[PDB]
């Protein structure tokens, strides 16, 4: 209830496939600080299950190696909102998407949302897409973000963006 932008009519089947975390922003610098930061995850693939849920495959530098973790987002009454009984927070909201190029989502903690708001701009190809980065910056003008990271093409093809 902080993020005011949501996708009217999301077809979770069409967002299936491979995605690249082109940019990420959070309300707390320490949330995305170092490579070992708790909410510094890189999306690899979204696989919507027939049941309505969504399987998310992501990379994260855990101990001292790029670990691949599999998280699952259960659907809810609203088609753009998903729950995850996973990392700190619990709600996943899909803000906008044209299905073929970009996707902007934001994770939010229910009780401590301002202390846990991370958002990303997912793109389909390892290219710096200006129109997606503009729409991302847009949906973020109204949010309390304090750190914003962006990645280059060569970095996008590396596991964990090294």
Curated annotation (Swiss-Prot):
Highest taxon of source: Eukaryota
Record's comment on post-translational modification: Alternate disulfide bonds occur in equal amounts in all variants examined.
Pfam families named among the record's database cross-references: Lipocalin
Effect of residue 59 to H: In variant C; found only in the Jersey breed
GO cellular component: extracellular region
Claim: Disulfide bond is one of the keywords in the record: yes
Tissue: Synthesized in mammary gland and secreted in milk.
Keywords: Allergen, Disulfide bond, Milk protein, Retinol-binding, Secreted, Signal, Transport
Chief localisation class: secreted
SUPFAM superfamilies reported for this sequence: Lipocalins (SSF50814)
Keyword Transmembrane included in the entry's annotation: no
Annotated S-S bridges: 66-160, 106-119, 106-121
UniProt subcellular location: Secreted
Family: Belongs to the calycin superfamily. Lipocalin family.
Main function: Primary component of whey, it binds retinol and is probably involved in the transport of that molecule.
Name assigned to this protein: Beta-lactoglobulin
